[PDB]
Amino acid sequence: MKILITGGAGFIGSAVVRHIIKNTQDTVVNIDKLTYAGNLESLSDISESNRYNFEHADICDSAEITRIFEQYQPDAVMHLAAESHVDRSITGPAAFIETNIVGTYALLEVARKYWSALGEDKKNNFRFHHISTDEVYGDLPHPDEVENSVTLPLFTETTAYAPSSPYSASKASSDHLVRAWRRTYGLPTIVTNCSNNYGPYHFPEKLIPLVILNALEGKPLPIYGKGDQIRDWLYVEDHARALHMVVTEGKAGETYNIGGHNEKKNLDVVFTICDLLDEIVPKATSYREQITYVADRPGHDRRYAIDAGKISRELGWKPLETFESGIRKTVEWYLANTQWVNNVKSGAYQSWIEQNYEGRQ
Amino acid sequence: MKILITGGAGFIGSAVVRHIIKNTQDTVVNIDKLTYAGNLESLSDISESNRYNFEHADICDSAEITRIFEQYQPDAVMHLAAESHVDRSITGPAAFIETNIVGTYALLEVARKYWSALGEDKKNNFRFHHISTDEVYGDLPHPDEVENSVTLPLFTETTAYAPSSPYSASKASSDHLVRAWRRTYGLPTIVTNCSNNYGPYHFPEKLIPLVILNALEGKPLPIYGKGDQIRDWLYVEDHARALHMVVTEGKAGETYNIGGHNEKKNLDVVFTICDLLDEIVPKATSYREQITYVADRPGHDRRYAIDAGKISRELGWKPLETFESGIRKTVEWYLANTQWVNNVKSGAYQSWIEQNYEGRQ
Ligand SMILES: NC(=O)c1ccc[n+]([C@@H]2O[C@H](COP(=O)([O-])OP(=O)(O)OC[C@H]3O[C@@H](n4cnc5c(N)ncnc54)[C@H](O)[C@@H]3O)[C@@H](O)[C@H]2O)c1
Ligand SMILES: NC(=O)c1ccc[n+]([C@@H]2O[C@H](COP(=O)([O-])OP(=O)(O)OC[C@H]3O[C@@H](n4cnc5c(N)ncnc54)[C@H](O)[C@@H]3O)[C@@H](O)[C@H]2O)c1
Ligand SMILES: Cc1cn([C@H]2C[C@H](O)[C@@H](COP(=O)(O)OP(=O)(O)O)O2)c(=O)[nH]c1=O
Ligand SMILES: Cc1cn([C@H]2C[C@H](O)[C@@H](COP(=O)(O)OP(=O)(O)O)O2)c(=O)[nH]c1=O
């Protein structure tokens, strides 16, 4: 099967591309604009494959995207291209509205026209897989807000949308467009909403990779508020396996939440990374001494937790890593890939760090 | 109070403006792009008031909208500007993405910057009222799908978003942006979602005005599918009263569904109109003879029904008209306002009619 993937040069996208080329017989055409988050180095291990092709393009460029669809004749689409950082969306929402909402709209129109003109066979089997986030569901009650006996709620596929940030509002909106295109035009769409991802090739602006790199560089490890906020951590390679399973076996019109049921408090994750580094790269003092509390994120969602029961019983997907095994693999990966890390740390990255962290709130 | 209203030259917007000038002590600055749906003739009753000012502008024009906010120094905003026709959104979705989503974003940013620079007093009392639709909730179970005994569900403020069309997806997206701006920046926003409106100054592309006018012009009365689909009808003047009540007494961060609990089947509404015309403007044959069953709307939502319990018990709002009283007033209004009709109908209107109805599906 020929799969057209947008955002394949990103964190999760590159994992999807590497997985497809290494463990399947499908082919891939990767469309990526190469923003600050795009990195062809993350695809170095498969870029030479005859089953892989790269197209440097913007999903908003309708004419070019249209041409690419006609050239490669994809059997399915996996849409991961997006602006993904909540903190960047707070100070610069425009890029999120543009890429996440308008860009998904532009891609949907190209896909709709393409799909509509396909032969009976190919048309019935075509699939448009929209990759999304658990953040569209809003925030969940926190353990410190309920009785120490009551069972905390989880995000299910029927949980009402209630996005808190420009980023999550942008993704929620994109999800709606995908479903409306399905209901109105019949386009065979599938939507997945996954918990936080972590692992190899993660851009150093998200919690885990930022903490790992800052720790090694002797810099502060910024904790928003009290660090008691909760996130559900899924290893990126596990997400990638789930995504290929969904695009291949998922049912059109369905939604599948993806997660490994691994709720963790931010501070706990940071301590875990620090202890791992104290063990692997010991120095005079503990990396813990770099933990630093800083002003909280405006509108911060205090708890995300995904119920992946549906995808488990319907597709049989199960994560292979545990947070313990995954976080160690992640720390080990960054220590073994200083080449990749040094390249992704440009003056642009430093400017973002100064913008979001120095003189912070 | 100075109220900045967007889309005040439209159907509901003009009713809001007329209500404010005629029945309150508040002032108004109307911003409208004057698309096919914006007609200054709908505001003839109050265009000369010293308490009314009109600004011909596009909400997407940030520079101009900013200048307007600074000049008039509004105490509140009532955002009604939008592309509102589901059928137009099916064949031309771009305008909906642009105006409903990106336009709302653009307006939210101008309002945020304005609100943030306000003095303590004016800043605490400021309100950004987003006018929306019940269509964001998706479709509801239809009477012919459930036991003739079970109680049919209604749309409540906690009903999950599930937009079916490009139009409703566009509005659902705008709603999310408004709530996200509140959660992230603190902007004091309010969102209302109302059922279908009908009454004076309704553009002739929606069911009721189209049927009334086509009947009087000896043209077909186009029924999508079997006409067994259900809509909840609220007289436009009742909506206007509710809206001013909300912007004035509504609580920041709250959502209020608006409706009069008047579920009706499309075919029944058409028969009611035909009976009224057979009575008021009798001819050789019944107007019913012009009814024609045409291809159904793609993705057609079969039933909308709003539960207005919350706004009723919290703000004390109640509709003054019944569907019986309102529909008769509507028919009488069109019979007496041929001048307005002829001024709003144009060459573009006939192009839309041919596009959507002739050789239809
Ligand atoms: N990172 C997470 O924990 C997480 C969790 C749930 C869902 N998601 C979703 O998964 C997808 C991928 O996330 P990610 O973390 O890998 O993002 P990322 O920031 O690592 O990468 C984004 C990628 O998209 C590309 N891109 C951006 N705008 C583009 C445009 N206009 N045209 C083409 N390419 C464009 C970038 O160049 C980059 O390669 C997104 O849709 C995101 O919302 C991410
Ligand atoms: N008509 C209904 O039954 C109904 C029901 C529920 C909610 N709503 C909502 O109520 C609001 C008004 O609905 P309506 O029926 O009166 O619409 P309408 O079609 O009658 O009028 C839309 C108005 O917005 C203006 N407009 C469009 N794009 C603009 C832009 N970019 N900048 C400035 N002005 C622009 C038009 O010129 C026009 O005056 C909308 O937000 C709509 O979604 C309508
Ligand atoms: C980037 C960052 C995040 N966080 C917190 C905020 C979130 O609760 C959690 C993960 O943030 P992040 O990686 O930005 O992911 P997301 O916002 O999608 O969940 O870590 C910090 O405490 N400090 C930081 O420097
Ligand atoms: C415009 C139109 C609508 N309808 C139906 C579709 C809807 O069920 C109902 C009202 O349609 P419409 O006025 O377009 O409003 P909305 O889509 O917001 O509810 O009337 C017809 O049967 N024929 C027509 O020509």
Swiss-Prot record, chains A, B:
The active site is at D134 (proton donor), E135 (proton acceptor), Y167 (proton acceptor). Gene3D superfamilies: NAD(P)-binding Rossmann-like Domain, UDP-galactose 4-epimerase, domain 1. Pathway: Carbohydrate biosynthesis; dTDP-L-rhamnose biosynthesis; Bacterial outer membrane biogenesis; LPS O-antigen biosynthesis. GO terms for biological process: dTDP-rhamnose biosynthetic process; lipopolysaccharide biosynthetic process; O antigen biosynthetic process; polysaccharide biosynthetic process. Its cofactor is NAD(+). It catalyses: dTDP-alpha-D-glucose = dTDP-4-dehydro-6-deoxy-alpha-D-glucose + H2O. Substrate binds at residues 84, 133, 196, 206-207, 222-224, 231, 266, 296-300, 357. Keywords: Lipopolysaccharide biosynthesis, Lyase, NAD. It holds the Pfam family GDP_Man_Dehyd. SUPFAM superfamilies: NAD(P)-binding Rossmann-fold domains (SSF51735). Binds 1 NAD(+) per subunit. NAD(+) binds at residues 11-12, 32-35, 58-59, 80-84, 99, 167-171, 197. It comes from the Bacteria. Coiled coil: none annotated. Its EC number is 4.2.1.46. InterPro entries: dTDP_Gluc_deHydtase, NAD(P)-bd_dom, NAD(P)-bd_dom_sf. One of its GO terms (molecular function) is dTDP-glucose 4,6-dehydratase activity. Belongs to the NAD(P)-dependent epimerase/dehydratase family. dTDP-glucose dehydratase subfamily. Catalyzes the dehydration of dTDP-D-glucose to form dTDP-6-deoxy-D-xylo-4-hexulose via a three-step process involving oxidation, dehydration and reduction. NCBIfam families: dTDP_gluc_dehyt, PRK10084.1. Homodimer. This is dTDP-glucose 4,6-dehydratase. It comes from Salmonella typhimurium (strain LT2 / SGSC1412 / ATCC 700720). The lineage of its organism: Bacteria, Pseudomonadati, Pseudomonadota, Gammaproteobacteria, Enterobacterales. The gene is rfbB.
